[PDB]
Amino acid sequence: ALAPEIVGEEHYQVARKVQQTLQRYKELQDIIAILGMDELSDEDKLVVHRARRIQFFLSQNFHVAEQFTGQPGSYVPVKETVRGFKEILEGKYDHLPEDAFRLVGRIEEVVEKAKAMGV
């Protein structure tokens, strides 16, 4: 069902761009392990910076996961998650820490958690 005519052109584009970014992030980890982040370019440093945040934002809190976490779950609409991923790829939230995207849900929750942690 992941085709432009079925899921929408912008949805398909943002999903494929996220996939490409993650796959490129996978391509850099050996270089990072052997050399350190200092050998990367300013653009590739930004790519890794955004890719870690995307990977953490792919996580979610489940209602049935209360038995393991304590925190309640959340429901994320498709349009909301598409907009959030488009914003993250645009860079509106590069300044926030990567762990601010762990198990959150909406970007409206990412910003709230970032404010809560006192950064």
Binding site: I34, G36, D38, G70
Partner: protein, 124 residues
């Protein structure tokens, strides 16, 4: 008390691999390593030495609140052993509270007792 320990170890999983070849300049990562080494050394136990849950909760609380962040890893092993005796000698009411009601006692009394022990422990 034990919710934080899973992530405290989990960060250590990657930080141990990275620290062997990384620059190691980030003080946040240094603190992560300092907490991970201490919790690893605390989780050790000797053969046929049972520990009641009322004292397990308190040693885990002391570890996770940061009271052990200054005790060296070479000394935390003896720190726990002396802390059990001190807790039995003075903080027995906290142990009775935990045994009766499964919840933790009030934090301020527990923090005061832990500080009173830390001001008596000898650091090598």
């Amino acid at each position: 008390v034990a919710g934080t320990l899973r992530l405290d170890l989990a960060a250590y999983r990657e930080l141990e691999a990275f620290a062997q070849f990384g620059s190691d300049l980030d003080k946040a990562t240094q603190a992560k390593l300092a907490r991970g080494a201490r919790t690893v050394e605390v989780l050790k136990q000797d053969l046929h030495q049972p520990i009641p849950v009322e004292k397990q909760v308190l040693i885990i609380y002391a570890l996770t609140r940061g009271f052990l962040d200054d005790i060296p890893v070479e000394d935390v092993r003896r720190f726990e052993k002396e802390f059990y005796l001190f807790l039995d000698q003075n903080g027995q009411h906290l142990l009775e509270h935990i045994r009766t009601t499964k919840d933790l006692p009030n934090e301020d009394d527990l923090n005061k007792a832990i500080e009173a022990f830390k001001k008596t422990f000898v650091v090598s």
